[PDB]
């Protein structure tokens, strides 16, 4: 019957993350067991699953890394870690991922994305990019 | 061993209050097209503990304009009465078998009013005083109907004991002879506990946390858990008096489980009612409960006086 | 001793919980948080002033109706008597008289609030 | 095992509690309060994270300065911040409150709520998307996660 | 090539509903009082 | 040792400072939780010349700009030398609670301070605190002070209510500065 | 035209049937069970919430968030110190100071944006005649200090070197509309 089909779907959700280890690693870390098609992995380890039968806010989702640039992100998960290759796809600006439609490569684009830095070092301290405008007189090193 | 029985009667009720919090939030959520807590635990089963620890680690407030004695002794009274009301509850065999159980209930609740009513005075603020006076009006509205409804209901029982209703409902619920009495008792239990649509004491958009605006920490936690314990209590009383579960002298655990089911349904109904309707105005409440419920309550008291007699259905004394 | 025991235990629970609430945390006391709330700005006056209530008559008649509750409440014991007719008529008289008084208050507009 | 380890774990526990149950205040002055509402709306439900509004400041653990702060409303904001009981946090929302915003050079505007209340996190925008304010809230959670209060108590 | 401007499709969009639609339901009132009074008399017996 | 290492230094020597979140006036006012206040020799044979925080702060903030004060010590004392009994009486009048003084030796009060200082948290009292409370303040007129640095010292009577209204109850919180029969000054 | 919202046509039709119907609207809370059933219906719907850091709300190529200064494919700096982005910026968030680069090129020695004054309006990116400054996609740069939101040339060039893979594509989508 119908109850049986939905319970079968629940069993598929329960048994589709490796084993109990991976099931818990996903459930206590994202609060969702939902299965989707692996669209493509990142160079850091993010997964970027997909399932189009869901409604238009849950048909794309990330499963973040456990270590991005030496931060131990098993729990301290944040949204800045999605590089721009996948920002466009995750926020549904396109239906074209970087596996099929990659971006134009340029010699100045960062190879290693950076998570948000606001409390650590490696953050942004502001300053004036200009120079001394008025130059003061340097007196002699001799008397008279 | 009585102390172990006190444990079994006390700590699960506190767990159940703490998880009624979660059930409230999640049912209001799903009635609001959203999901409640699912972050802190697997499905939010630790959010009550997080809330409690956060409250008991926040610094309290002893303001300067207040009366510290009432300020501190009122939450004590609130929790103590909310937790003492659960004591003579037959589920089916009670801890404290009293021959005047419902009188103890009524007196304990009418004293539970005084927690709110002294806290609001000791908190020397305008909003607290608004809330205390609103509670005065609320009690003046509902207590008359509570007493007379319960009188006319137990007029087919024969006693004020609560163990006797389990025998009065051996073959049938008291909901069928008295559904109107059950209706008005339900709304009375709703005005009691200061629950919606009759909140009228913590009236967020009228009284910004009335009778609690100066309470921050574990004191506020005490008021909160007292409310969420009296809710389960009143649902338990509804299902003991009206929705009588099955006794089966060999098996009392069947009574306990059916009582659990019915009280869960009635508490979920309380949350449903909160999510559905807006607040009354606290003069509309008095007018309603003096001009619609009290005449009908008196008339049905008359009817349930006549009814034992012209039916020859007078109940027994013990 | 059982009911006394239970109530003492609940009293102890509450007092221990309040001790915890007051002596566990860290405090930074000063007059700008110990002064009364009143929604951002300070009070123009005190809260310990006359608060004109407008259901005082309904409060008095609630007191009278509580006395009537007291008179009605012995019925679960009265009904087991042998007569069953004096009590029937007296309960009818009591309830009808109470309801007549309520109707008089209603018509003379005591249940209404002093606008 | 060791006293310092026990203290670190107790710190983790209390930080987890204060981090998972933070109760912001119904304090929304201008447009940014609408995005605050939309973060209370079903798509980005705050209550999922244990974040529920309490209209009283004394039942509040954080304030979100969502709107422009005038010279006439600053005393009230400061009275409310004082009335909040410690531990207490502030979150400045929008360019009007972080700095002056679109009214920095005007006569009745304080050029930053940070002139009046201390600020833990600044959420930029005009308005910020509710996802952005949610990022700010979770950043405040990350911040509470590393308090090390009982540690310094042990090391005093 | 010719222009492209996101116009409505040819033949207009479908018929949108805007009027109030609160459908009557329930019983006839007679029946509700009858069921209540029947349960009441049965419980009395 | 600071002179021995870093000369061309400034060494400020304030008296016991009072302020909103001090540990001097609040410390004497928190003696209401005990129903009587102990004082060595009933407060007499002890003299206190307290100073306000704003004065010391302005003094430091000017000394960091004064071309003088490079090898100078200072005595940030403030005016109106006070006798301890009268000072605590003024505290317990401005904080309108009550006043039950009584004598106490120094050895038992030292033991009290010790067992109070048996605390992992911030203690209420200590042996060194009692000792520092019950020795008089030096007549500071051998040294410059504030007015040699650009601050006119503030009397206690003008700023104490800001500190002490926190401790009042209702029935007295709405009371002014001019209803406390001020403390009796001494010179000695 | 118009139409009434709370005006009956008129009165004076009553029968025992209609009176019983209104009396069972009363005395049974008929019109309240409807709201109860409504809220119950909502209990059994898929909620619209999303696991935010993992699954995120939909945005568009036109979306304007963080700011960034761009380059040509040669890596050449694209701004030219024309200083109309500061002329029009209605919050006066942009200060610019320029010089010849010692290659003889028109370039800025300064480009600051107080991001606590920017109203995120996009006038600068639609006024820049070279598409140098844009308003990128990012909305997740909340900070613990005010000073971090006071940008300079280096932070903007870093935002450009970061988000060019996304900026270029969103521009690719969005031109022909501007
Ligand atoms: C007091 C008795 C204990 C009450 C229960 C406390 C449970 C705490 C817990 O479950 O930790 C959850 C958390 C689980 O991780 P987390 O919730 O902090 O990580 C964030 C998860 N997301 C990304 C979904 C927001 O454990 C910890 O991270 C460490 C803090 C707890 C330390 C407890 C040590 C004892
Ligand atoms: C099961 C749910 C019910 C929960 C209710 C019961 C709560 C259980 C919580 C157990 C953990 C108790 C830790 C409380 C610590 C709160 C106070 C705090 O963190 O401040 C640091 C305090 C203060 O440390 P401090 O000395 O460094 O204070 C610094 C002072 N200032 C601010 C001026 C710089 O440290 C402690 O005292 C921790 C030990 C308290 C143990 C008491 C027993
Ligand atoms: C899960 C649990 C589901 C419970 C059902 C919830 C209600 C669902 C909505 C039903 C609905 O839409 O009906 C609308 C309709 C609304 O009807 P209407 O608004 O269209 O009115 C039609 C015309 N007149 C006025 C003449 C009736 O309501 C009904 O069907 C009947 C309403 C009367 C209900 C009587 C309630 C008495 C309660 C006390 C008795 C004890 C209760 C049990 C305690 C245990
Ligand atoms: C911070 C301050 C807060 C103070 C909280 C105070 C809590 C009060 C709670 C309200 C209680 C009011 C009603 C009194 C208790 C119920 C009285 C009662 O009817 O039962 C008493 C009980 C037996 O009574 P009965 O059933 O008539 O006869 C038994 C025959 N087998 O057996 C008895 O006769 C003994 C009754 C002893 C009652 C104990 C009261 C404890 C008070 C502690 C203070
Ligand atoms: C055999 C012959 C003799 C038989 C004798 C018996 C005769 C039949 C007796 C029928 C009487 C039934 C009792 C009904 C009580 C309600 C009375 C009433 O009229 O409603 C009161 C109030 C009126 O509101 P208003 O629109 O202003 O109308 C008044 C106009 N002057 O309207 C309201 O009450 C609204 C306020 C309450 C809203 C609270 C929300 C409740 C939601 C429904 C909960 C349902 C669940 C109940 C479960 C309880 C089970 C224990
Ligand atoms: S920053 Fe913008 S959106 Fe926010 S309050 Fe100011 S004008 Fe409104
Ligand atoms: S988006 Fe508008 S307010 Fe922001 S920098 Fe550009 S022109 Fe100025
Ligand atoms: S960013 Fe663009 S508009 Fe602004 S000065 Fe440079 S070239 Fe001109």
In short:
Chain F is α/β, with parallel strands linked by helices and 188 residues long. Chain F has helices at residues 2-5, 25-29, 53-63, 84-94, 106-117, 127-133, 156-164, and strands spanning 11-12, 17-18, 37-39, 47-48, 51-52, 73-74, 82-83, 101-103. The longest helix of chain F is centred in the middle third of the chain and has 12 residues, at 106-117.
Q: Please, what is the CATH homologous superfamily of chain C?
A: NADH:ubiquinone/plastoquinone oxidoreductase, chain 3
**What is the CATH topology descriptor of chain C?**
Methane Monooxygenase Hydroxylase, Chain G, domain 1
How far apart the termini of chain C lie comes to: 52 Å
- Could you give the count of β-strands of chain G? 5
Query: How helical, in percent, are the residues of chain C?
Result: 55-70%
How much is the radius of gyration of chain C in Å? 26 Å
Supply the number of structural domains of chain C. Answer: 1
* CATH A-level architecture of chain C: Up-down Bundle
* Distance between the first and last residues' Cα of chain G: 40 Å
Oligomeric state as shown: part of a larger assembly
Number of helices of chain G: 5
Main sheet properties of chain G: 3 strands, antiparallel
Helix and strand composition category of chain G:
alpha+beta
Please report which band the strand proportion of chain C falls in: under 5%, 5-15%, 15-25%, 25-35%, 35-45% or over 45%: under 5%
Which kinds of small molecule does this entry bind, naming each only once?
1,2-diacyl-SN-glycero-3-phosphocholine, 1,2-Distearoyl-sn-glycerophosphoethanolamine, iron/sulfur cluster
Strand order of the largest sheet of chain G: 2-3-5
SSE-based structural type of chain C: mainly alpha
PDB class: oxidoreductase
Keywords: NADH, ubiquinone, oxidoreductase
Entry title: Cryo-EM structure of respiratory complex I in the active state from Mus musculus at 3.1 A
Chain A: NADH dehydrogenase [ubiquinone] 1 alpha subcomplex subunit 12
């Amino acid at each position: 019957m119908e109850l049986v089909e939905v319970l079968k779907r629940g069993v598929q959700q329960v048994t589709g993350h490796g084993g109990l280890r991976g099931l818990l690693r996903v459930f206590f870390r994202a609060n969702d067991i939902r299965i989707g098609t692996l669209v493509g992995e990142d160079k850091y380890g993010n997964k970027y699953y997909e399932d189009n039968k869901q409604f238009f806010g849950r048909h794309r989702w990330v499963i973040y890394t456990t270590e991005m640039n030496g931060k131990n992100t098993f729990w301290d998960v944040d949204g800045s870690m999605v590089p721009p290759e996948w920002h466009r796809w995750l926020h549904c600006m396109t239906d074209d991922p970087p596996t099929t439609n990659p971006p134009t490569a340029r010699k100045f684009i960062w190879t290693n994305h950076k998570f948000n830095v606001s409390a650590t070092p490696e953050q942004y301290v502001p300053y004036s990019t200009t120079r001394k405008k008025i130059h003061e007189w340097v007196p002699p090193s001799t008397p008279y | 061993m009585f102390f172990i029985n006190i444990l079994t009667l006390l700590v699960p009720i506190l767990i159940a209050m703490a998880f009624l919090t979660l059930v409230e939030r999640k049912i209001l959520g799903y009635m609001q097209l959203r999901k409640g807590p699912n972050i802190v635990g697997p499905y939010g089963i630790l959010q009550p503990f997080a809330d409690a620890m956060k409250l008991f680690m926040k610094e309290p407030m002893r303001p300067l304009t207040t009366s510290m004695s009432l300020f501190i002794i009122a939450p004590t009274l609130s929790l103590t009465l909310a937790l003492s009301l659960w004591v003579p509850l037959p589920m089916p065999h009670p801890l404290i078998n009293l021959n005047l159980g419902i009188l103890f209930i009524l007196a304990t609740s009418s004293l539970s009013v005084y927690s709110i009513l002294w806290s609001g005075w000791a908190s020397n603020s305008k909003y607290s005083l608004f809330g205390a006076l609103r509670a005065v009006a609320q009690t003046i509205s509902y207590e008359v109907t509570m007493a007379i409804i319960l009188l006319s209901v137990l007029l087919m029982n024969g006693s004020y004991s609560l163990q006797t209703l389990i025998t009065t409902q051996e073959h049938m619920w008291l909901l069928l002879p008295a559904w109107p009495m059950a209706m008005m008792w339900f709304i009375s239990t709703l005005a009691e506990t200061n629950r919606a649509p009759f909140d009228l004491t913590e009236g967020e958009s009228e009284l910004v946390s009335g009778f609690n605006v100066e309470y921050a920490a574990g004191p506020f936690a005490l008021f909160f858990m007292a409310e969420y314990t009296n809710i389960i209590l009143m649902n338990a009383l509804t299902t003991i008096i009206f929705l009588g579960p099955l006794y089966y002298i060999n098996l009392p655990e069947l009574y306990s489980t059916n009582f659990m089911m019915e009280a869960l349904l009635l508490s979920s109904t309380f949350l449903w009612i909160r999510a559905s309707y807006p607040r009354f105005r606290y003069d509309q409440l008095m007018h309603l409960l003096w001009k619609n419920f009290l005449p009908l309550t008196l008339a049905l008291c008359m009817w349930h006086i006549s009814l034992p007699i012209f039916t020859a259905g007078v109940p027994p004394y013990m | 001793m059982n009911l006394y025991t239970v109530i003492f235990i609940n009293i102890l629970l509450s007092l221990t919980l309040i001790l915890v609430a007051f002596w566990l945390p860290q405090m930074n006391l000063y007059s700008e948080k110990a002064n009364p709330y009143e929604c951002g700005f300070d009070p123009t006056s005190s809260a310990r002033l006359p608060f004109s209530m407008k259901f005082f008559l309904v409060a008095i008649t609630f007191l009278l109706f509580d006395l009537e509750i007291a008179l009605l409440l012995p019925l679960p014991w009265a009904i087991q008597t042998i007569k069953t007719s004096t009590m029937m008529i007296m309960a009818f008289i009591l309830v009808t008289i109470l309801s007549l008084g309520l109707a008089y208050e209603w018509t003379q507009k005591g249940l209404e609030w002093t606008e | 095992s060791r006293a310092e380890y026990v203290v670190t774990k107790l710190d983790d526990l209390i930080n987890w509690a204060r981090r998972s149950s933070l109760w912001p205040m119904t304090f929304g002055l201008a447009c940014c309060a609408v995005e605050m509402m939309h973060m209370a709306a079903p798509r980005y439900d705050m209550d999922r994270f244990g974040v529920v509004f309490r209209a009283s400041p004394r039942q509040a653990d954080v304030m979100i300065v969502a709107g422009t702060l005038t010279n006439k409303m600053a005393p009230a904001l400061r009275k409310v911040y004082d009335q909040m009981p410690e531990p207490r946090y502030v979150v400045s929302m929008g360019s009007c409150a972080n700095g002056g915003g679109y009214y920095h050079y005007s006569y009745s505007v304080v050029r930053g709520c940070d002139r009046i209340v201390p600020v833990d996190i600044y959420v930029p925008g005009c308005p910020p998307t509710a996802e952005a304010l949610l990022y700010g809230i979770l950043q405040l959670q990350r911040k509470i996660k590393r308090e090390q209060k009982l540690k310094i108590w042990y090391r005093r | 090539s010719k222009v492209k401007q996101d116009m409505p499709p040819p033949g207009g969009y479908g018929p949108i509903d805007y009027k109030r639609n609160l459908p009557r339901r329930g019983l006839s009132g007679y029946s509700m009082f009858a069921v209540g009074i029947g349960a009441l008399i049965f419980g009395y017996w | 040792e600071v002179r021995s290492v870093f000369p061309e230094a400034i060494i400020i020597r304030p008296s016991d400072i009072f302020g909103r979140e001090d540990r001097f006036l609040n410390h004497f006012a928190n003696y209401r939780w005990f129903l009587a206040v102990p004082l060595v020799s009933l407060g007499f044979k002890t003299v206190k010349q307290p100073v306000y925080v704003a004065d010391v702060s302005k003094g430091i903030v000017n000394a960091t700009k004064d071309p003088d004060a490079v090898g100078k010590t200072f005595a940030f004392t403030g005016p109106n030398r006070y006798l301890l009994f009268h000072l605590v009486k003024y505290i317990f009048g401005m904080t309108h609670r009550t006043f039950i003084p009584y004598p106490l030796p120094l050895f038992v009060y030292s033991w009290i301070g010790k067992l109070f200082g048996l605390s992992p948290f911030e203690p209420w009292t200590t042996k060194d605190k009692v000792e520092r409370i019950h020795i008089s303040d030096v007549m500071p007129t051998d040294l410059p002070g504030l007015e040699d640095l650009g601050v006119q010292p503030t009397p206690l009577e003008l700023k104490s209510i800001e500190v002490l209204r926190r401790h009042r109850t209702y029935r007295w919180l709405s009371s002014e500065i001019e209803e406390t029969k001020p403390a009796k000054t001494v010179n000695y | 035209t118009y139409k009434y919202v709370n005006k009956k046509e008129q009165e004076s039709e009553v029968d025992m049937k209609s009176a019983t119907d209104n009396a069972a609207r009363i005395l049974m809370w008929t019109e309240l069970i409807r709201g109860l059933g409504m809220t119950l219906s909502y209990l059994f719907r898929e909620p619209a919430t999303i696991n935010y850091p993992f699954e995120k709300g939909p945005l568009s190529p036109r979306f304007r968030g963080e700011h960034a200064l761009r380059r040509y494919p040669s890596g050449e700096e694209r701004c030219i110190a024309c200083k109309l982005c500061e002329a029009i910026c209605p919050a006066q968030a942009i200060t610019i100071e320029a010089e010849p680069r010692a290659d003889g090129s028109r370039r800025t020695t300064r480009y600051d944006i107080d991001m606590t004054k920017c109203i995120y309006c996009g006038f600068c990116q639609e006024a820049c005649p070279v598409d140098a400054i844009v308003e990128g996609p990012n909305f997740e740069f909340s900070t613990e200090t005010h000073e971090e939101l006071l940008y300079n040339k280096e932070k903007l060039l870093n935002n450009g070197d970061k988000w060019e893979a996304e900026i270029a594509a969103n521009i690719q989508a969005d031109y022909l509309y501007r």
